[PDB]
Amino acid sequence: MREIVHIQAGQCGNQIGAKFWEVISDEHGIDPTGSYHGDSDLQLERINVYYNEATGNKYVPRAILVDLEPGTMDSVRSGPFGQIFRPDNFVFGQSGAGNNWAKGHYTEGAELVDSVLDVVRKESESCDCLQGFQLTHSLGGGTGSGMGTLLISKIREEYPDRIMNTFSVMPSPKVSDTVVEPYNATLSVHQLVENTDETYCIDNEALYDICFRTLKLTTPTYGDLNHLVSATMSGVTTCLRFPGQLNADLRKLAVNMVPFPRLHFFMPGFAPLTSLTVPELTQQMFDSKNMMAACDPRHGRYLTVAAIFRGRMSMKEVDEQMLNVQNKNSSYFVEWIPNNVKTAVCDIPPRGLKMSATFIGNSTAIQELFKRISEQFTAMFRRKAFLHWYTGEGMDEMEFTEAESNMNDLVSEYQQYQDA
Amino acid sequence: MYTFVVRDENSSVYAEVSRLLLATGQWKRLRKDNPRFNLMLGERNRLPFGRLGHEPGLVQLVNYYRGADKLCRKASLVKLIKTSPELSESCTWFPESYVIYPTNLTDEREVFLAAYNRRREGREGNVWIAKSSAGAKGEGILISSEASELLDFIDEQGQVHVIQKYLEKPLLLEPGHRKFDIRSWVLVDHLYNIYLYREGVLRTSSEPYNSANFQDKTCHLTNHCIQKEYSKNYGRYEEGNEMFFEEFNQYLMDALNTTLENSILLQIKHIIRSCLMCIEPAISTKHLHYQSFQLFGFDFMVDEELKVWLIEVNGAPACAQKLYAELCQGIVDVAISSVFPLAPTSIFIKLHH
Amino acid sequence: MEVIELNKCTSGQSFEVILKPPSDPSLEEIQKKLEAAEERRKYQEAELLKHLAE
Amino acid sequence: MRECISIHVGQAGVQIGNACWELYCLEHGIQPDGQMPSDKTIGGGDDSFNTFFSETGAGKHVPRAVFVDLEPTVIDEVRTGTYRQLFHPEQLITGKEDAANNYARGHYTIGKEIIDLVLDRIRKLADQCTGLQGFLVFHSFGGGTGSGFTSLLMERLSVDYGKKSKLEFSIYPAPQVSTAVVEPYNSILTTHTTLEHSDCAFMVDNEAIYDICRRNLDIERPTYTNLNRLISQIVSSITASLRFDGALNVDLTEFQTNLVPYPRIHFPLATYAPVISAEKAYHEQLSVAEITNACFEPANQMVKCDPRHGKYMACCLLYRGDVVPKDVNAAIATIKTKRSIQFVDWCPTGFKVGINYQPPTVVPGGDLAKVQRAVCMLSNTTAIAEAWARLDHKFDLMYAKRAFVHWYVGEGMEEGEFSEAREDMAALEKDYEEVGVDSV
Numbered sequence A: 001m002r003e004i005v006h007i008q009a010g011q012c013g014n015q016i017g018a019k020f021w022e023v024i025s026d027e028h029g030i031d032p033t034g035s036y037h038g039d040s041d042l043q044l045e046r047i048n049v050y051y052n053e054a055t056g057n058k059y060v061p062r063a064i065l066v067d068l069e070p071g072t073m074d075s076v077r078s079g080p081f082g083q084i085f086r087p088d089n090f091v092f093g094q095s096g097a098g099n100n101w102a103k104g105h106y107t108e109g110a111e112l113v114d115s116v117l118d119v120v121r122k123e124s125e126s127c128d129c130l131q132g133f134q135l136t137h138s139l140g141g142g143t144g145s146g147m148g149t150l151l152i153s154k155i156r157e158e159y160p161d162r163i164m165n166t167f168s169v170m171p172s173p174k175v176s177d178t179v180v181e182p183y184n185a186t187l188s189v190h191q192l193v194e195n196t197d198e199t200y201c202i203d204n205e206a207l208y209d210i211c212f213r214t215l216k217l218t219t220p221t222y223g224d225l226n227h228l229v230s231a232t233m234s235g236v237t238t239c240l241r242f243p244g245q246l247n248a249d250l251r252k253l254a255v256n257m258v259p260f261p262r263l264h265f266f267m268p269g270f271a272p273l274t275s276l277t278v279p280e281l282t283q284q285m286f287d288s289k290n291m292m293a294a295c296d297p298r299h300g301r302y303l304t305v306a307a308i309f310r311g312r313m314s315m316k317e318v319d320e321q322m323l324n325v326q327n328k329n330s331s332y333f334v335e336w337i338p339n340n341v342k343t344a345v346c347d348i349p350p351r352g353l354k355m356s357a358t359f360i361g362n363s364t365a366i367q368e369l370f371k372r373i374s375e376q377f378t379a380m381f382r383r384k385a386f387l388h389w390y391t392g393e394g395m396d397e398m399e400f401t402e403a404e405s406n407m408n409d410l411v412s413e414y415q416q417y418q419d420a
Numbered sequence B: 001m002y003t004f005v006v007r008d009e010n011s012s013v014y015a016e017v018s019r020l021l022l023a024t025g026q027w028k029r030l031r032k033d034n035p036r037f038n039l040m041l042g043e044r045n046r047l048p049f050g051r052l053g054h055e056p057g058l059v060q061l062v063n064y065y066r067g068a069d070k071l072c073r074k075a076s077l078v079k080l081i082k083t084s085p086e087l088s089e090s091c092t093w094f095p096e097s098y099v100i101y102p103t104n105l106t107d108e109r110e111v112f113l114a115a116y117n118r119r120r121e122g123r124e125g126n127v128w129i130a131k132s133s134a135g136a137k138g139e140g141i142l143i144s145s146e147a148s149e150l151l152d153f154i155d156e157q158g159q160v161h162v163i164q165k166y167l168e169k170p171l172l173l174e175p176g177h178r179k180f181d182i183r184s185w186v187l188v189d190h191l192y193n194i195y196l197y198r199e200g201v202l203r204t205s206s207e208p209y210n211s212a213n214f215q216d217k218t219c220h221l222t223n224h225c226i227q228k229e230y231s232k233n234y235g236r237y238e239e240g241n242e243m244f245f246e247e248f249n250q251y252l253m254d255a256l257n258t259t260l261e262n263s264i265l266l267q268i269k270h271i272i273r274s275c276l277m278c279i280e281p282a283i284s285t286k287h288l289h290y291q292s293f294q295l296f297g298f299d300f301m302v303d304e305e306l307k308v309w310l311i312e313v314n315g316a317p318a319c320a321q322k323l324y325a326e327l328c329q330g331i332v333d334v335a336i337s338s339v340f341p342l343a344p345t346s347i348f349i350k351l352h353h
Numbered sequence C: 001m002e003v004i005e006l007n008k009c010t011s012g013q014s015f016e017v018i019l020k021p022p023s024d025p026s027l028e029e030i031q032k033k034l035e036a037a038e039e040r041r042k043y044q045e046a047e048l049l050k051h052l053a054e
Numbered sequence D: 001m002r003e004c005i006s007i008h009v010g011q012a013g014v015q016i017g018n019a020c021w022e023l024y025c026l027e028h029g030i031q032p033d034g035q036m037p038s039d040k041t042i043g044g045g046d047d048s049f050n051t052f053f054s055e056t057g058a059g060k061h062v063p064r065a066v067f068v069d070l071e072p073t074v075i076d077e078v079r080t081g082t083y084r085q086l087f088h089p090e091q092l093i094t095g096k097e098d099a100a101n102n103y104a105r106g107h108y109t110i111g112k113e114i115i116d117l118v119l120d121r122i123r124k125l126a127d128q129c130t131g132l133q134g135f136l137v138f139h140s141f142g143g144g145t146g147s148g149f150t151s152l153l154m155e156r157l158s159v160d161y162g163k164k165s166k167l168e169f170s171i172y173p174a175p176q177v178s179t180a181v182v183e184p185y186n187s188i189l190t191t192h193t194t195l196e197h198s199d200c201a202f203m204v205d206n207e208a209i210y211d212i213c214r215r216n217l218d219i220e221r222p223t224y225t226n227l228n229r230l231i232s233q234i235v236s237s238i239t240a241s242l243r244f245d246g247a248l249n250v251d252l253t254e255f256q257t258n259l260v261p262y263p264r265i266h267f268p269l270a271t272y273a274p275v276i277s278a279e280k281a282y283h284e285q286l287s288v289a290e291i292t293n294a295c296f297e298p299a300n301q302m303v304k305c306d307p308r309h310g311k312y313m314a315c316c317l318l319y320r321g322d323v324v325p326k327d328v329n330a331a332i333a334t335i336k337t338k339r340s341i342q343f344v345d346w347c348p349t350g351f352k353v354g355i356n357y358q359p360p361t362v363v364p365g366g367d368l369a370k371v372q373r374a375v376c377m378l379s380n381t382t383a384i385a386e387a388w389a390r391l392d393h394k395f396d397l398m399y400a401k402r403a404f405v406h407w408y409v410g411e412g413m414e415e416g417e418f419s420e421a422r423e424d425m426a427a428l429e430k431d432y433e434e435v436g437v438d439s440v
Ligand SMILES: *[C@H]1CC(=O)C[C@H](C)CCCC(=O)O[C@H]([C@H](O)NC(=O)/C=C\C=C\C)C/C(C)=C/[C@@H]2C[C@H](C)C[C@H](C1)O2
Pocket: A023, A215, A227, A228, A230, A231, A234, A270, A272, A273, A274, A275, A276, A280, A350, A351, A352, A353
């Protein structure tokens, strides 16, 4: 199990995804033209996980760029590393999805999905042993949300035994483009609950607050939020991208982080986030301010945690400090999953830092995220507000009732394990 | 922050230790089955010693010595003594005792009658007592001068028992012509230092000693629970039939022209050390992956010659009400904070070995 | 304390010391277990594909 | 001469197997290319070392070993490592996707597909044996391959080689050492399925090896390489009697005869002494009495547990180096009067002693100092049931909420196999209790 197929859909999924390939291309020593110029062989050992090797010693991201309108893709092609993607791996239409999940899922997106699946199959067929798929997208718009979840369904149908992993940006009223975001997100969460194995939940308000309250950026842009996401995505994929103590792939991750199939929505975090020591990395990576789901972990309990340290540092002080925090936060870890906190280390630090830490928590506190979405959804749905945008695409109110009912069920299942 | 768990609800001693640990601000009580504790205050039975000492990054400490039951069960005490050369069949401070398993369930039944018959050829006091660990507070015992009556009682019971020579010449406190027993509290720490709490207690009897009838049993048994239920003058001479060392030492001076230390404590200290040094190789945690301490209750009898006799060792003792605060503080100071420092004139006598 | 069965050679020796005297499933059944587990995997998959068809 | 086939399953089994064959080559003077100059019978012989090594016409001495893993990266290191030339390709078997830490994936889904190839490769080795005595099987409890594929392989070995002894070396899971959350499930599932197929199994607790490596070798953060070089020392001291001239433990059946009176209670405790750091320049050498008394210190045991609080059924002392029987007898008498050594009253209080005169060999540049004398004690004590209690308890915490169970059911395993496996461990814990505890 080596190759991962990456998919990025819609404006948000494509802008975060572009940044992700920029960051990991740097780490692995690939330049904007796909040529390797690295000082270490740790960089090439697991390069095939994310890059196809072409003739001429070039490495091409195993990446598929999807959108229902051309703008963001054009931006990407003109971007820093735009020329590194396979040109025939851009798949886009002209109409757009109007921030409308029904257009992404059922109409506009349905017209385009087969050609996306052609490229997916072409990337999969040239895999020695496909691990699975990683999708980047937002849940609040139309393409990444509606078409993204459509893609996931059709990938599951064609590759039912592969791991499906998403980086899903969750809308917040504080950092919002349209009022329909709660509708699009409630509809998508229903899909994610049934069809992914691992979903990193990234809350745009959490990203904003980190940029504004902690990093002291007077006026964050989406670019500032996306720099945080790409840093975190580099962190959570370190163990896939570099050798180490662990034999780490997407399946071992799901087996160890997901005790019940539906509870697979992780809170990620990054450290340091300050405006230099191991105890500093460790204290930060465990407080709410470094987490990206806008959920207070102290309001719930961790079922499982994965922590990945990067840089030269004392493994002894690492293990020592991890074991310390588990007593400061003794009550916030469930007692019926022994040894549910896994530490991994990588020697290679991210650019611009001597050391760093990425946190992946499966905490019952993430129920707060789905509660917020559910309340916003219900405030509008009780009055059927904005629904004509969806009924106009052939959808029926009952599909909204079922999505709301499924998400409220999800909330109740988290609460069940928080009292166990 | 240090962490501990409570697994014996009915413990007066550790209930107080628990409280003191919170009151220092640096101890958190976790839930009963949380494995990431520094200290376990264990259950009295089937404590999971096998689960201690495998939590990485945690020094773990438990308030019981695994194996100490060998001293703290009446039948095993007898066995241990007769089979350990340091103690021996010839031990001078332990009453002649035999393990008698009842037929309705190796047995020393024959060896007992052999020595019993010798005494019958004596006109010497041939009174004995049958006891067991299944005793309640405090019934479950029989005092008889007749051998067949003792084996009849035990076989009525169908449980492991011991027969033990009754001390026919107890030291009798005056006024009152009354019998007593001495309880000493002993704390053994993780280094196997043996600490005798400077405060003991005599559990006195309020009824004059009566060699005529061992049938009554109230002037013969010194248990506090007994005296409150089947007595006559419970509380006449001392509050709660509890005499403490300061008064008892004064008594020994005034009446006998000696001291508690010379006439009794040397022997108590000798016995305690003997018993505990004997089992030390079997129960010591010096090189174990977890650590133990334990509080013991030693019960002694004094004869009219001022000779001290070990009666039994209790592995889960309660304290006297007047002494809880001092002793429990002493546990925290000596057995816990010694392993987990927080941030006098000791109340204990260290028994050197 | 007595020693018995002392054997010596150029490479070493062995002996015993006594301190006190004393007082399957067939291939068919396996294949069936592995096929029954495979049937269950296939059944769960068909349910998934049937749900995706809906 | 009767041959032994070693089988190494999964990452732990393969990496431990690597350490062992490396050490065996040092002990017998076999070079990484397989040439053995001290071997005068070229292409053939029935020397003691031939139980583990066959020989080609070109003078190459080839381990009687199969390495199997459901993923290729660990065995690939063998294929390209220092000892690549030792093994031929047919004896290195890899699949493509591993068991993902999931017993059910290794046992059912993926194991079904590779098991027949493994047997074919093992049959090739068997066909070169004039008198195969059986198999030494190395694996982790916690890995999906080490647990699941191993239990499948053991079942099939009992069918295809019903009269042959099967010994295990099993790595018991420790959170100090890269343990996955579901390792207690896998450990219990594989123990249940393997119990009736294994004649004798030596458990090595990674926590004990880790601590010995920290405390005696002054390695702050032991790697698998550190851990495996120490384990291979113990394994080699356990197998030396099959590989060298001697009269104690000369065939696999003798391990059962000398250590396992009750067949289910087949888990001897290994204790090993002395373990001395090679970086420790000045070191005084330990006496027979000293290394033998060390065998009763929990800190030197392969599994941390308290033998004072259980009973012994059998006890073997395996010495390497400058040791004569007189010192062993004087050491034992001394220890018998200083230690809590209670036997069950239906076995004699006694020790079987084996001395090999060649001192332990150590890997050049390793962490272990050369010593004049070492000893491995194999004792079948009920105290080892502590390790089952610990593991069963972690199983219980998770299973009570059915955590992670869906991953196993998802590969075609029935939930009931969990409770069946757990009830079998409950019974096993009872067996140790009735064997070794006085009711009083
Ligand atoms: C992204 C770099 C950018 O384009 C912007 C800058 C050049 C600077 C980025 C700085 C950054 O965001 O720093 C944060 C954090 O504020 N830094 C610290 O707290 C540093 C030391 C504190 C000690 C107590 C850290 C981040 C998010 C770094 C990421 C890591 C990546 C993988 C690459 C991006 C480059 O920066």
